[PDB]
Design a protein around this nucleic acid. Structure first.
Ligand SMILES: [Mg+2]
Ligand SMILES: [Mg+2]
Ligand SMILES: [Mg+2]
Ligand SMILES: [Mg+2]
Ligand SMILES: [Mg+2]
Ligand SMILES: [Mg+2]
Ligand SMILES: [Mg+2]
Ligand SMILES: [Mg+2]
Ligand SMILES: [Mg+2]
Ligand SMILES: [Mg+2]
Ligand SMILES: [Mg+2]
Ligand SMILES: [Mg+2]
Ligand SMILES: [Mg+2]
Ligand SMILES: [Mg+2]
Ligand SMILES: [Mg+2]
Ligand SMILES: [Mg+2]
Ligand SMILES: [Mg+2]
Ligand SMILES: [Mg+2]
Ligand SMILES: [Mg+2]
Ligand SMILES: [Mg+2]
Ligand SMILES: [Mg+2]
Ligand SMILES: [Mg+2]
Ligand SMILES: [Mg+2]
Ligand SMILES: [Mg+2]
Ligand SMILES: [Mg+2]
Ligand SMILES: [Mg+2]
Ligand SMILES: [Mg+2]
Ligand SMILES: [Mg+2]
Ligand SMILES: [Mg+2]
Ligand SMILES: [Mg+2]
Ligand SMILES: [Mg+2]
Ligand SMILES: [Mg+2]
Ligand SMILES: [Mg+2]
Ligand SMILES: [Mg+2]
Ligand SMILES: [Mg+2]
Ligand SMILES: [Mg+2]
Ligand SMILES: [Mg+2]
Ligand SMILES: [Mg+2]
Ligand SMILES: [Mg+2]
Ligand SMILES: [Mg+2]
Ligand SMILES: [Mg+2]
Ligand SMILES: [Mg+2]
Ligand SMILES: [Mg+2]
Ligand SMILES: [Mg+2]
Ligand SMILES: [Mg+2]
Lengths: 117, 64, 201, 144
RNA sequence: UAGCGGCGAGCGAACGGGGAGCAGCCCAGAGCCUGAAUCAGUGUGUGUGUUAGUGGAAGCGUCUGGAAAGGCGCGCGAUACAGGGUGACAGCCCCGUACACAAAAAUGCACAUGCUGUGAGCUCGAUGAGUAGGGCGGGACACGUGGUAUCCUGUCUGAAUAUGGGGGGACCAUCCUCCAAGGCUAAAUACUCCUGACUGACCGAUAGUGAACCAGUACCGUGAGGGAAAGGCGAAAAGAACCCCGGCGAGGGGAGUGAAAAAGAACCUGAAACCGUGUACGUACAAGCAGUGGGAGCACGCUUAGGCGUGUGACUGCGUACCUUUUGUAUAAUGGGUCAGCGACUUAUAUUCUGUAGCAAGGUUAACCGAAUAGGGGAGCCGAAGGGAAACCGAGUCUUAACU
C-alpha cells in the first residue's frame, strides 16, 4: 500500500503554524517551537478565563471603594449597608454607576448609611 | 506450528471432568520413618491443583 | 412458492425456504467478503534487512566517534535500508461453510424475488452467434445489465454475450453471489431453476 | 440489495489495537508494556512454568502412573449409537462401518447413556447393567 | 500422541487410514527349439508443434477549446468493448484484438515401418562367506546405553547354507511372515541461470533490484572486497532570426515561436526551512520561556454615520520550554541546529477467551478429484461420561476387609 504521508503532515503542521502567528522568531516559523508555544497559550487561556473574573471584581471593588470614600463611607460599610438594605446590585453595575452617575451612587450611599444607622 | 506439550507436566497432572487437574502429593518418596502415618495417609490420595497455580499448568498443558 | 414466467405466462412451483427466505445480511456479507478475498491474488514482497543487498559490517565503530550507534547499512531506519516487516506472498482465502454458502444464496435469491430482479423464462436462445441479435433480444426484453443463467451450454449465446460488458452468461452450476448482486436483472431458464433448486435442496 | 448496501452484524468486526500512535489512542508510547522491564523488551518474556528461579510446580511434584496401550484400542458406546448401525446387529465391524469407534479398536462396552427405542442384537461386546436392562426392555438380545 | 530426555531445555515417531501416481525385471546356467517380445541406434513417411509472417470489421455533424478522443445529436460493428498510441477521456484514426490461415529450410514430439544390433519362450537346475552373528570403540535409527531390539563399521574374530537362515523392540518357547550377503527400473517429487504469454487490493524515483539515467559505474581499498548519487521543456524544437548593454564574455532586456517562456534547456506542479525588497504599526529610562487576560493609540477596509472587522501592540495582572528517566527536574540531569522525506507491536501456524453468524446432540471436512471460489470427498478432529496408576467398572467409580 505504502501510504505516503506528506500531505497529511503538511496540513497538520500548517494548522499549528497558523495559530502561531505573531510570535517571535522561530515560534512562528518552526513547528517544534510553535506547537510547544500553542499548547502553552492554551494553558494560559484556560487559566486566564478564570483570572478575568478575579481581576475585574478587583477593579470594581477598588472603584466602589474610591467613590464611597468620596461620599464618606468605606467599602465594607457600604456593602454591609446594601446587604442590610437588601440591595442586590452587583459590583460591576456599582462600578459603572460610580463612574457615569455619581448622583445615583450617592443615593445608594445614603441608603446604606440609613441601613447602618 | 503446533504448540508443544511440556512433557513433565503431562506426566505430573491429569485433567478432571470440570477442567480441574489432579496431582500426586510431594514428600512421599523417601525419609519416611520419621513422618507420622497420619501425614502419609493424608498424602497418598491425589489432590487438586490450586487456583493460584492452575494458570501455569494450563500454560504447560495446552492439549488437555 | 410460485414463480410466474415472463414469456409464456405460466407458473412454476418452487420451495419457499429457497425463494422466500428472509434476508440474512450478515451471512451474505460474510460470503461476499470471502468471495472477493478468494479472488485476491496476494503476490507481493519487500526485502527485509536480511534480504537487502549489502554487507554486514558496521559503518563505523561503536564508540569514540560522535555519531549514533549503528550496526548495519541494511537497517530499516536508513535510506535504502530494509523494510521492518517486509511482506511475503500470502493467501487471503477464507473458509466459508457449505451451509452458510447455501444460506446466502437462498437469501439473496429470495431478495431478488422480493425486489423483482429475477426473470424466469422457459428458453433464452439466439439463433446465430451475433451480439447484434442478443442486444436486439435484450432490448425487446427491456434489459441492459443482466446475468443470463442457462441450464445448458449454449456456445452461440456465449459468443454473442462475450463482448457485452453489461451482459454475462453463466451455467446454472457456475453462479456466484457477488454476480447475483452485481447485476441489475437475472434471467433464469426454468431448467436452471430446477438445477438451482436441486443444488440448494 | 447491492454491493454498497451490505453491512456486517453489530459487534462482528472489532477494530483492533494499534500500539504507538499517540496519546489519545490510549496505547501510547509504551503500548501496554509499562517501563523498563524484561516484559517490555522485544521478544522478552519467560517460558512456561517459570517462577523466577524457584523450583516450578511441574518439578516440585512427582511423576505418577503409566500409560495403558489397551485403553487406546478400547472404546465406549452410547445406547443412542445403537440405532445408527444397519441390520439391527451391533458388532465391532458394524460400528467401524458406522464410523463410531475407529478401525484400530478391538474392545468396546455399551454404557447407559442416551436411550434406545428398537431391539438390537449385541454380539461380542461388554454391556453395563443399565444398558442391559434398557436393551432387554426394548427387545434386544445380548449375546457373545 | 507413544516415547527420548541433567525425565531439564527441548527432540519427537510409527502402526494404521485417506489420496497423487503406479511397472516390473535380469545375472549368478545348462539344454531344446533360434532371432520370435522388448529396447537402443539409424533411415523413411504422416500428423502435430517451434523458429519469419498474412488478412482482419465498423462515424459523421455541431459547441467549447491551442488541439476533440470530451459535451450534445444522429448512426454502425462486434466469436473483435484485451491492451497501447494518437495535440484532453476513441469499440468505429492507427497498431492490434476475435477469428481465419501460412514455411523454401532447420528442428522437437508422437505414431507407423525399414535396416543394424539385441534376444523371446519352454524344461531342468542353481539360490550371492571373511558374509550373518559375536567381543571392544563410535555412529544412525524419535530412542542421549538405558532392560534396548534394528541398521552402519574402525579393530579382532567368525557360522549354518532350503532338512537352512532373518525378523516379529531385552530374552526363551510356539506360531506367523520373509529369503540378506549381485544388480536395473518410468511416473507422481524438487528447482529456475533462461525464453514466451498473462496477472497483481505489489512499488512509483529517500520507494521498487545496489542500479528507471553508459551501475556493479564513479569512488575507496595493496588486496579479497565494499559501493553510491543522479528520472520529467513542449503536442511538436516550432530549442529564441534580429536588435541592445557587456570583454567578438557571462548574464540580462526586447522581438519572435508557442495555448502558455512567472513551460527558455540551472526547463511539469515548485511546499517548507533559509535569505531579501516594499508598506503599516511598534521600538533608543528599559530587565527574565517572550506568551496569555485586559487594553490605549495608529493605520486600513466595509457601513446608511449605527459600529464591526483586520494588522500592530504603549501600559498592566499572571506566568521559570518539550521529551525521557525519576521519590522528585526551571533544573546547572538526558536528547534534539532547523526544515522536508523515511522511520518502530507485524506476519505465518497452532491454542484459549469474547463477540458475531450458520447448524445443532451433533458440528465440520484436510488432502485430493473437479474447469474448478460449485459439487464431491467425513481419512479424520472436537463434543455428547466419567472414575481409576492400571486392568477394569460405568452414572457412577476409586480408596478400603468394608465404609456411618
Ligand atoms: Mg507505496
Ligand atoms: Mg512566516
Ligand atoms: Mg516410593
Ligand atoms: Mg566479521
Ligand atoms: Mg529498500
Ligand atoms: Mg539505492
Ligand atoms: Mg470444498
Ligand atoms: Mg523508556
Ligand atoms: Mg523500573
Ligand atoms: Mg514491566
Ligand atoms: Mg530481538
Ligand atoms: Mg536457587
Ligand atoms: Mg498484418
Ligand atoms: Mg483493423
Ligand atoms: Mg491537456
Ligand atoms: Mg539370496
Ligand atoms: Mg554385523
Ligand atoms: Mg546385538
Ligand atoms: Mg559399531
Ligand atoms: Mg569381527
Ligand atoms: Mg541381522
Ligand atoms: Mg516380542
Ligand atoms: Mg536385492
Ligand atoms: Mg518526485
Ligand atoms: Mg533507487
Ligand atoms: Mg547571450
Ligand atoms: Mg532548479
Ligand atoms: Mg504536462
Ligand atoms: Mg518549475
Ligand atoms: Mg517560499
Ligand atoms: Mg518612543
Ligand atoms: Mg521611551
Ligand atoms: Mg529525552
Ligand atoms: Mg536518577
Ligand atoms: Mg513513577
Ligand atoms: Mg535521583
Ligand atoms: Mg518546579
Ligand atoms: Mg541555563
Ligand atoms: Mg537541560
Ligand atoms: Mg543517565
Ligand atoms: Mg545536544
Ligand atoms: Mg519531519
Ligand atoms: Mg487466537
Ligand atoms: Mg465464535
Ligand atoms: Mg461417591
Amino acid at each position: 500500500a505504502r501510504v505516503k504521508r506528506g500531505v497529511i503532515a503538511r496540513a497538520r503542521h500548517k494548522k499549528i503554524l497558523k495559530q502561531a502567528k505573531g510570535y517571535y522568531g522561530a515560534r512562528s516559523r518552526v513547528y517544534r517551537v510553535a506547537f510547544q508555544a500553542v499548547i502553552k497559550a492554551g494553558q494560559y487561556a484556560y487559566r486566564d478565563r478564570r483570572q478575568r473574573k478575579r481581576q475585574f471584581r478587583q477593579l470594581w471593588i477598588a472603584r466602589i471603594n474610591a467613590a464611597a470614600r468620596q461620599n464618606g463611607i468605606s467599602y465594607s460599610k457600604f456593602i454591609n449597608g446594601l446587604k442590610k438594605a437588601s440591595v442586590e446590585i452587583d459590583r460591576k453595575i456599582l462600578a459603572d454607576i460610580a463612574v457615569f452617575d455619581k448622583v445615583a451612587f450617592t443615593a445608594l450611599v445614603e441608603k446604606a448609611k440609613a441601613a447602618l444607622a | 506450528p503446533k504448540i508443544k506439550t511440556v512433557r513433565g507436566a503431562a506426566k505430573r497432572f491429569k485433567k478432571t471432568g470440570k477442567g480441574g487437574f489432579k496431582h500426586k502429593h510431594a514428600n512421599l518418596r523417601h525419609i519416611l520413618t520419621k513422618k507420622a502415618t497420619k501425614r502419609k495417609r493424608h498424602l497418598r490420595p491425589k489432590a487438586m491443583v490450586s487456583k493460584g497455580d492452575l494458570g501455569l499448568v494450563i500454560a504447560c498443558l495446552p492439549y488437555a | 412458492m410460485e414463480l410466474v414466467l415472463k414469456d409464456a405466462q405460466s407458473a412454476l412451483t418452487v420451495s419457499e425456504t429457497t425463494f422466500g427466505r428472509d434476508f440474512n445480511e450478515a451471512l451474505v456479507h460474510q460470503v461476499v467478503v470471502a468471495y472477493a478475498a478468494g479472488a485476491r491474488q496476494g503476490t507481493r514482497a519487500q526485502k527485509t534487512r536480511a534480504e537487502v543487498t549489502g554487507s554486514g559490517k558496521k559503518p563505523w565503530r561503536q564508540k569514540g566517534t560522535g555519531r549514533a550507534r549503528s550496526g548495519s547499512i541494511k537497517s530499516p531506519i536508513w535510506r535504502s535500508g530494509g523494510v521492518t516487516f517486509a511482506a511475503r506472498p500470502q493467501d487471503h482465502s477464507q473458509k466459508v461453510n457449505k451451509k452458510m454458502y447455501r444460506g446466502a444464496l437462498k437469501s439473496i435469491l429470495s431478495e431478488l424475488v422480493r425486489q423483482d430482479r429475477l426473470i424466469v423464462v422457459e428458453k433464452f436462445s439466439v439463433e446465430a452467434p451475433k451480439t447484434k441479435l442478443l442486444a436486439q433480444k435484450l432490448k425487446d426484453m427491456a434489459l441492459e445489465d443482466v446475468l443470463i443463467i442457462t441450464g445448458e451450454l449454449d456456445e452461440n449465446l456465449f459468443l454473442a454475450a462475450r463482448n457485452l460488458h453489461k451482459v454475462d452468461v453463466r451455467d446454472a452450476t457456475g453462479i456466484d453471489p457477488v454476480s447475483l448482486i452485481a447485476f441489475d436483472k437475472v434471467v433464469m431458464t426454468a431448467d436452471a431453476v430446477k438445477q438451482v433448486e436441486e443444488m440448494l435442496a | 440489495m447491492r454491493l454498497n448496501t451490505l453491512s456486517p452484524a453489530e459487534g462482528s468486526k472489532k477494530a483492533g489495537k494499534r500500539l504507538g500512535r499517540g496519546i489519545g489512542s490510549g496505547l501510547g508510547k509504551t503500548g501496554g508494556r509499562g517501563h523498563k522491564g524484561q516484559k517490555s523488551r522485544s521478544g522478552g518474556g519467560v517460558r512456561r512454568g517459570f517462577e523466577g528461579g524457584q523450583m516450578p510446580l511441574y518439578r516440585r511434584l512427582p511423576k505418577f502412573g503409566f500409560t495403558s496401550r489397551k485403553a487406546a484400542i478400547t472404546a465406549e458406546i452410547r445406547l443412542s449409537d445403537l440405532a445408527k448401525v444397519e441390520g439391527g446387529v451391533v458388532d465391532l465391524n458394524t460400528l467401524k462401518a458406522a464410523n463410531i469407534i475407529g478401525i484400530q479398536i478391538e474392545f468396546a462396552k455399551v454404557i447407559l447413556a442416551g436411550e434406545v427405542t428398537t431391539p438390537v442384537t449385541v454380539r461380542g461386546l461388554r454391556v453395563t447393567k443399565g444398558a442391559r436392562a434398557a436393551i432387554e426392555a426394548a427387545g434386544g438380545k445380548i449375546e457373545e
